[PDB]
Amino acid sequence: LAAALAQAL
Ligand SMILES: *C(=O)c1ccc(-c2ccc(C(=O)OCC)cn2)nc1
Ligand SMILES: *NNC(=O)c1ccc(-c2ccc(C(N)=O)cn2)nc1
Ligand SMILES: Cc1cccc(C)c1
Ligand SMILES: Cc1cccc(C)c1
Ligand SMILES: Cc1cccc(C)c1
Ligand SMILES: Cc1cccc(C)c1
Ligand SMILES: Cc1cccc(C)c1
What we know:
Layout: H1 2-6
The chain binds ethyl 5'-formyl[2,2'-bipyridine]-5-carboxylate (I6W), 5'-(hydrazinecarbonyl)[2,2'-bipyridine]-5-carboxamide (I77) and 1,3-dimethylbenzene (5 copies).
């Protein structure tokens, strides 16, 4: 889940 968001950065 964290990675799914972190792609934004
Ligand atoms: C949420 O974005 C997210 C994405 C990917 C993963 C995840 C956990 C573990 C592996 C892995 O290769 O584990 C080897 C033990 C890959 N991806 N978790 C949360
Ligand atoms: N928000 N994330 C990024 O902007 C981001 C872009 C690219 C990469 C990345 C990581 C690792 C490789 C590699 N070839 O091992 C390439 N690009 N990370 C984050
Ligand atoms: C951070 C990241 C790695 C692999 C695939 C996705 C969608 C995101
Ligand atoms: C982010 C990442 C690196 C290496 C291997 C996996 C499955 C995921
Ligand atoms: C915004 C964010 C949360 C967790 C992990 C990373 C790399 C970024
Ligand atoms: C407020 C906000 C928007 C997009 C992405 C993040 C990590 C935060
Ligand atoms: C270019 C940029 C916008 C927002 C957040 C970061 C870390 C960089």
